[PDB]
From Swiss-Prot:
UniProt EC number: 1.3.5.2
Residues that hold FMN according to the record: A65, G66, F67, D68, K69, S89, N150, N181, K224, T252, G275, G304, Y325, T326
Family label: Belongs to the dihydroorotate dehydrogenase family. Type 2 subfamily.
Name used for this protein in its record: Dihydroorotate dehydrogenase (quinone), mitochondrial
GO cellular component: cytosol; mitochondrial inner membrane; mitochondrion; nucleoplasm
UniProt function note: Catalyzes the conversion of dihydroorotate to orotate with quinone as electron acceptor. Required for UMP biosynthesis via de novo pathway.
Matches recorded under InterPro entries: Aldolase_TIM (IPR013785), DHO_dehydrogenase (IPR050074), Dihydroorotate_DH_2 (IPR005719), Dihydroorotate_DH_cat (IPR005720), Dihydroorotate_DH_CS (IPR001295)
CDD domains for this protein: DHOD_2_like
Subunit text: Monomer.
Mitochondrial intermembrane side: 1-364
Organism: Homo sapiens (Human)
Keyword flag Transmembrane helix: yes
A GO BP annotation: 'de novo' pyrimidine nucleobase biosynthetic process
Length: 364
């Protein structure tokens, strides 16, 4: 399309030339929340529908956590053509996150590095925001457009599992799925929650809290993992997820690694790296986790998706659904329909009747 070129060649480079990335993000959140978006001309075909996590998803392409941290732009993101929206991470108490600057573009790499540190309006503020559109969301959910809520921990929390439990109690009843984010690289100690003994204790407490919610308000619970895990850590996660009946995995968060070859001047900033250089590390992590779980645990695949091919690679490796964030920085809103159109094309070329038939196809 005309819109795809204009955004990619003119609008987004202009925005980047005028605004630091934090400012640009805030402007984007505001524009999205007001629906000031190009026409999403693409119409989701039936071949893109997926049923997973107790829900229908109109298309498998979602917005990854971090773009709408505080649940301000949900409706605008469905307008953009996402099949599902995930907000957060949300922490129990409000907190400012790290000092500025804390996000960095690597345009030569089609990558970003961030160290926001869980800036968050907190559970109460987000609860009230979601409550104001709760039945609008119920209708969307029924129509195949579900909502996820991603939960974090405050910086000075003295009991991580209690922070997560509080999130389950407060936002659980407003979500179609919850995400226990134990993979931010930007909160000290947080990734150690991925260890076997810590995850089992943490997850058992999360699941108990969830199961105490009334049936119509009881979300699926997913765990979001890092791309930097050891083999032992992956095996341990898979074991715990099976043991406890965790509903799904989100694979992956940003990487603390710096793959060889990065060109951006800002490559050595501290934080998590996203976008193109994370792509195949994330696809590989999906593949491994799918195998370790016997294909029985739904996976949301994320990291470096900016085309239909990238989405199909993750689906074929084991993802039921995919998410993207960093591709918007570079391509803007038209990227969404681009992914979807390309994905539909490739599915037909590869002889799949729909997305569902492609899930895990590389393992067979
Ligand atoms: C600026 C920024 C902020 C993020 N904040 C969060 C977050 O609060 N919670 C979370 O689970 N992931 C967070 N993420 C990670 C993304 O959800 C996603 O896992 C990652 O960026 C890989 O996808 P991408 O390459 O399409 O950006 C963030 C990513 C970026 C770029
Ligand atoms: C001055 O800023 C704009 O014109 C923007 C952007 N943030 C526009 S114009 C139409 C549009 O879609 N956006 C936009 C919205 C979300 C995102 Br993500 C990127 C750009
Ligand atoms: O720093 C953050 O808030 C954030 C960054 C990120 O890359 N991942 C995440 O889970 N949190």
């Amino acid at each position: 399309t005309g819109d795809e070129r204009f955004y990619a060649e003119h609008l987004m480079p202009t925005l980047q030339g005028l605004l630091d990335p934090e400012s640009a993000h805030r402007l984007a959140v505001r524009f999205t929340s007001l629906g000031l978006l190009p026409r999403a001309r693409f119409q989701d075909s039936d071949m893109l529908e997926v049923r997973v996590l107790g829900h229908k998803f109109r298309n498998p392409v979602g917005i990854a956590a971090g773009f709408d941290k505080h649940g301000e732009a949900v409706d605008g993101l469905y307008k953009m053509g996402f099949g599902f929206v995930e907000i957060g991470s949300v922490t129990p108490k409000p907190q400012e996150g790290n000092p500025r600057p804390r996000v960095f573009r690597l345009p030569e790499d089609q990558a970003v590095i961030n160290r926001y540190g869980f800036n968050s309006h907190g559970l109460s503020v987000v609860e009230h925001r979601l409550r104001a559109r709760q039945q609008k969301q119920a209708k969307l959910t029924e129509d195949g457009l579900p909502l996820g809520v991603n939960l974090g921990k405050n910086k000075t929390s003295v009991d991580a599992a209690e922070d997560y439990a509080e999130g389950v109690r407060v936002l659980g009843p407003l979500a179609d799925y919850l995400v226990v984010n134990v993979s931010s690289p930007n909160t000290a100690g947080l990734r150690s929650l991925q260890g076997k003994a810590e995850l089992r204790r943490l997850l058992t407490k999360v699941l108990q809290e969830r199961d105490g919610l009334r049936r119509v308000h009881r979300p699926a619970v997913l765990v979001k993992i890092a791309p930097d895990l050891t083999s032992q850590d992956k095996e341990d996660i898979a074991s715990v997820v099976k043991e406890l009946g965790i509903d799904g995995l989100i694979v992956t968060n940003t990487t603390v690694s710096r793959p060889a070859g990065l060109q951006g001047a800002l490559r050595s900033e501290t934080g998590g790296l996203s976008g193109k250089p994370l792509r195949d590390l994330s696809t590989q992590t999906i593949r491994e986790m799918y195998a370790l779980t016997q294909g029985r645990v739904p996976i949301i695949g994320v990291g470096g998706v900016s085309s239909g091919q990238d989405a199909l690679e993750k689906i074929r490796a084991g993802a039921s659904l995919v998410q993207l964030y960093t591709a918007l920085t570079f391509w803007g809103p038209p990227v969404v329909g681009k992914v979807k159109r390309e994905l539909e094309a490739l599915l037909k070329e590869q002889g799949f009747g729909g997305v569902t038939d492609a899930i895990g196809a590389d393992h067979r």
